């Protein structure tokens, strides 16, 4: 497997003759250094239609590069999304095989610039399309990312819900009867408190609130943990006293209304929220790994074609370039670069920062 | 940590039992169902705070007169407390009411440059970084004489003559360098006072805290000087806490960036700060990580620390009240759980 | 719009006590001491809305003169833009506004 | 007209004016005027708010709206004043610190009226 194993794609004219091997085929004397780092590739590579001038070529390779290293962000942040959601589970990167392939097996080929991608236009015009589908699929990232925000959101709603027993704002913890069912107009006859200490202060509470706040009534108490709670009798026609003695015996109260309105309001808010949990985690999280796979193969397939771009540029018309895959072994990346710049014996504009070979790109 | 009661033992105990004051989870979370602002004051009343509010009007109460008044009582312990300090204590809370001298003297400069308006100015400028001689600081209309009115008689005397020279600050911004560049030696001096004279644990929970204090402030810096191109960076450098857990190896990178991706990489450098500024925004993590330093600076007893822990976890438990209360008044309660609370 | 407007500057406001909360200080005697020229500017231009002259309002966001986005924490460039976004809404009211006045 | 951004008129709530000079504001280089006149409720005099609004809407001369912030309720007699001409001036009146109801809206008074 090694999936981890780092990708260096390289290109090279037909003539070319590596000096580090003098005397060696090309394919032999690369395949004797990719056996020197213990490595292996194979050609990859299509005939793009850019014919354009030597400024238009640069201007292209240019955007290229730019949309290149937009599409590595989104795949990486696709990536680290897809982590996130408990998905990339043997490794951060190429755990999720594409096109019904593992990474390596898909990047053993690269005819994908045919049909659904060959539009045999100009590079720009290829260029911009990519790029437009690039955007589409970040914007279907940022759609699972709003996804899960809200999931998120939604579920520190219910941890608030269900915080505790006291001062819980979760209207199922109490009956719906005791509860000012079928309230009448005069006397709420409901009131609900969460006292400290022990449950003797509020009864206290309670006797205190039995005189001048409502007639004498019996209502059942809650736990609230160590905290004291209980059900209150509260009227009406004396709620502001009712709640004066709430507010002056320091029982922090909490009462609200338990109309069956509430109940089933709180009933479809915990339903709502259970359901965009799952939604984000199962149909946004399958959504996202399909774009994220796809924009795997978009980004293979731009980086391709800004490949074949630098050998229209650094190596010369007409085009005769022999391209190279990029698998290596997943310590040998140094070992590798060392002896492409070793064989790099062309391009000497450069001092006798990009690489001096025809095409060298690492990815992942 | 013996020795700490034989000075202030009863300062402690007074900081304490006004810890015991600050407002639970539970208090927010009853402040937070308020319907207005009245009901806000009167779900508070309930608090520590009692009827500190009840001299103004109902109708009258507003946000801003919430803000000015919890502080007002803030501010009010902190100075019975400082009256009440002697020694080393009383250098150290002064050293705190430097740290807000530094704004009231960065906020005198302005108006100072264009000196259109005075007095407004005093009323504005809070009452934590006062000092004595700030009304005659008022009267110079000049800037060079409110310079040497500031470079003597006033505790910022080392921190001008640190770093600046008399007629360098009329071409420096106030906000980007002067008053940044004068947190920043008044943040080397503290940790250098607290180096020197301080006794444990209250030395590791100052180290540990200030340099917070520092790194976020560098945070800020390189967070807010890439949409303004125009400091370099040797400037920023030179702008730089120069302490904390950045220094040295951080500060460096962040001074030499030139954009938010190089602060992400020379900022998720250092493990206290991975997904630091990846989500949300930088203050409600810089609080949230300030009240977990100041939790600790309260599970130590015998330590003077706890007075800044007492300062920074009241001033953010009052900008909670704040918060709370502009999320009533301007009824955008979507996002009224933004407070931090640790206790 | 009127009736929104209500809403958006009460948007606006909780932003800029969102700044402040995080900035700690009260920014706004810095703000107004910090103003060097006008980065939000009306295009005064006629319209010919049934046949009528009649002049609207359009918004010249330069962002190169950011005078007081350098200043104060990252909440105060947020603040900036979503006043900005907000002072759209306010002249495109008072387009209309004009508009209907004459 | 002269292009010219907003003028800021705020006696009612300070706030306000601070949220449009961090939008953005310009001060007169030359004249060593500003567009801002950010004024504390309570403490700048009713003569000194006309004062300003005349020096603004009817002494300055561009093309700009002028906010009020609700700051007219007192002024409420001026502003009719100068609502008779929409150049070089345009009325507004956001809503400051205290809300700004509708009903006190000399522009949505006059619509009102021609319903």
Redesign the interface.
Known sequence: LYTANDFILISLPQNAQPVTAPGSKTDSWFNETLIGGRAFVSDFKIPEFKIGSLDTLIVESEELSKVDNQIGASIGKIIEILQGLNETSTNAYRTLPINNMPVPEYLENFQWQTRKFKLDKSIKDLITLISNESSQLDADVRATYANYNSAKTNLAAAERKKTGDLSVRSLHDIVKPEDFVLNSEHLTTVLVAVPKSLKSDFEKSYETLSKNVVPASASVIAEDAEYVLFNVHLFKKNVQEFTTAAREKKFIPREFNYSEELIDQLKKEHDSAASLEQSLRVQLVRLAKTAYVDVFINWFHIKALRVYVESVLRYGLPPHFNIKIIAVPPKNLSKCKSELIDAFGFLGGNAFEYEPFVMYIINL | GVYFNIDNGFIEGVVRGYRNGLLSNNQYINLTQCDTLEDLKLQLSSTDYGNFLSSVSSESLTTSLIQEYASSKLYHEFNYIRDQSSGSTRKFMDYITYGYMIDNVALMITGTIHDRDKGEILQRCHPLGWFDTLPTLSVATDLESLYETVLVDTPLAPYFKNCFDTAEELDDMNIEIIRNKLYKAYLEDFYNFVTEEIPEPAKECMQTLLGFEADRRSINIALNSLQSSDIDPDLKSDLLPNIGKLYPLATFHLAQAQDFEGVRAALANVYEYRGFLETGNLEDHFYQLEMELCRDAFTQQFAISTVWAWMKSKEQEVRNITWIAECIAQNQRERINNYISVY | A??K??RV???????????S??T?????????????????????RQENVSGVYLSQ?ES?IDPE??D?????????????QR??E??SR??E??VE??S??? | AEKRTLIAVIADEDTTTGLLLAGIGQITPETQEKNFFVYQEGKTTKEEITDKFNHFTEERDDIAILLINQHIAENIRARVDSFTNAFPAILEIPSKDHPYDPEKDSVLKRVRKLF
């Open positions: 009127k009736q407007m209500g500057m009460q948007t606006a406001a909780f932003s800029l006590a969102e700044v909360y995080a700690g200080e009260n920014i706004g005697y810095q703000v107004q001491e910090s103003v060097s020229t006008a980065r939000f500017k009306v295009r005064a309002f010249y003169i950011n007081f986005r350098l200043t104060g924490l990252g909440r105060g460039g947020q603040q900036v006043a900005k907000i002072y306010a002249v009211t008072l506004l004009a209907l006045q004459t």
